[PDB]
Amino acid sequence: KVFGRCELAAAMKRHGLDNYRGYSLGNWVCAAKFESNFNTQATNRNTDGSTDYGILQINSRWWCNDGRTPGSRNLCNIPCSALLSSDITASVNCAKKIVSDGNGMNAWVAWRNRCKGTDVQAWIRGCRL
Ligand SMILES: [Cl-]
Ligand SMILES: [Cl-]
Ligand code: NA
């Protein structure tokens, strides 16, 4: 599913991401824009052999199981394919764990390089939220 911007904002907010670990909704929408272009089916192989999955490009080295990432953990206890669903519940639950791991949203390299410190509230402008 390719979410609309405000459609994703509303779903993230309903699932409790607004101000989760202090990160406003716009941070999460901005991260999803640059990780996946709002496409739940996005997958991208990393140089270390792991793969990033879904709307927030959650990686198979630590967080989900894809059966092809040696030495990997599955700390969200989820097949990585569950992070490609049109329902973002699994991705949100896993993202809550990732953002609680110690470095906040810097865990998402695209958030650090493209969203951090910017006017992230622009990403929810116009949304009836
Ligand atoms: Cl915001
Ligand atoms: Cl933080
Ligand atoms: Na894994």
Curated annotation (Swiss-Prot):
<keyword id="KW-0964">Secreted</keyword>
<feature type="disulfide bond">
    <location>
        <begin position="64"/>
        <end position="80"/>
    </location>
</feature>
<feature type="disulfide bond">
    <location>
        <begin position="6"/>
        <end position="127"/>
    </location>
</feature>
<keyword id="KW-1015">Disulfide bond</keyword>
<dbReference type="GO" id="GO:0050830">
    <property type="term" value="P:defense response to Gram-positive bacterium"/>
</dbReference>
<feature type="disulfide bond">
    <location>
        <begin position="76"/>
        <end position="94"/>
    </location>
</feature>
<dbReference type="Pfam" id="PF00062">
    <property type="entry name" value="Lys"/>
</dbReference>
<feature type="active site">
    <location>
        <position position="52"/>
    </location>
</feature>
<dbReference type="GO" id="GO:0016998">
    <property type="term" value="P:cell wall macromolecule catabolic process"/>
</dbReference>
<protein>
    <recommendedName>
        <fullName>Lysozyme C</fullName>
        <ecNumber>3.2.1.17</ecNumber>
    </recommendedName>
</protein>
<dbReference type="GO" id="GO:0050829">
    <property type="term" value="P:defense response to Gram-negative bacterium"/>
</dbReference>
<dbReference type="InterPro" id="IPR001916">
    <property type="entry name" value="Glyco_hydro_22"/>
</dbReference>
<dbReference type="GO" id="GO:0005615">
    <property type="term" value="C:extracellular space"/>
</dbReference>
<feature type="active site">
    <location>
        <position position="35"/>
    </location>
</feature>
<comment type="function">
    <text>Lysozymes have primarily a bacteriolytic function; those in tissues and body fluids are associated with the monocyte-macrophage system and enhance the activity of immunoagents. Has bacteriolytic activity against M.luteus.</text>
</comment>
<keyword id="KW-0081">Bacteriolytic enzyme</keyword>
<dbReference type="GO" id="GO:0031640">
    <property type="term" value="P:killing of cells of another organism"/>
</dbReference>
<keyword id="KW-0929">Antimicrobial</keyword>
<dbReference type="GO" id="GO:0005737">
    <property type="term" value="C:cytoplasm"/>
</dbReference>
<keyword id="KW-0326">Glycosidase</keyword>
<dbReference type="GO" id="GO:0042742">
    <property type="term" value="P:defense response to bacterium"/>
</dbReference>
<keyword id="KW-0378">Hydrolase</keyword>
<comment type="subunit">
    <text>Monomer.</text>
</comment>
<dbReference type="GO" id="GO:0005783">
    <property type="term" value="C:endoplasmic reticulum"/>
</dbReference>
<keyword id="KW-0020">Allergen</keyword>
<dbReference type="GO" id="GO:0003796">
    <property type="term" value="F:lysozyme activity"/>
</dbReference>
<dbReference type="InterPro" id="IPR019799">
    <property type="entry name" value="Glyco_hydro_22_CS"/>
</dbReference>
<comment type="similarity">
    <text>Belongs to the glycosyl hydrolase 22 family.</text>
</comment>
<feature type="binding site">
    <location>
        <position position="101"/>
    </location>
    <ligand>
        <name>substrate</name>
    </ligand>
</feature>
<feature type="domain" description="C-type lysozyme">
    <location>
        <begin position="1"/>
        <end position="129"/>
    </location>
</feature>
<keyword id="KW-0732">Signal</keyword>
<dbReference type="InterPro" id="IPR000974">
    <property type="entry name" value="Glyco_hydro_22_lys"/>
</dbReference>
<feature type="disulfide bond">
    <location>
        <begin position="30"/>
        <end position="115"/>
    </location>
</feature>
<dbReference type="InterPro" id="IPR023346">
    <property type="entry name" value="Lysozyme-like_dom_sf"/>
</dbReference>
<dbReference type="GO" id="GO:0042802">
    <property type="term" value="F:identical protein binding"/>
</dbReference>
<dbReference type="GO" id="GO:0016231">
    <property type="term" value="F:beta-N-acetylglucosaminidase activity"/>
</dbReference>
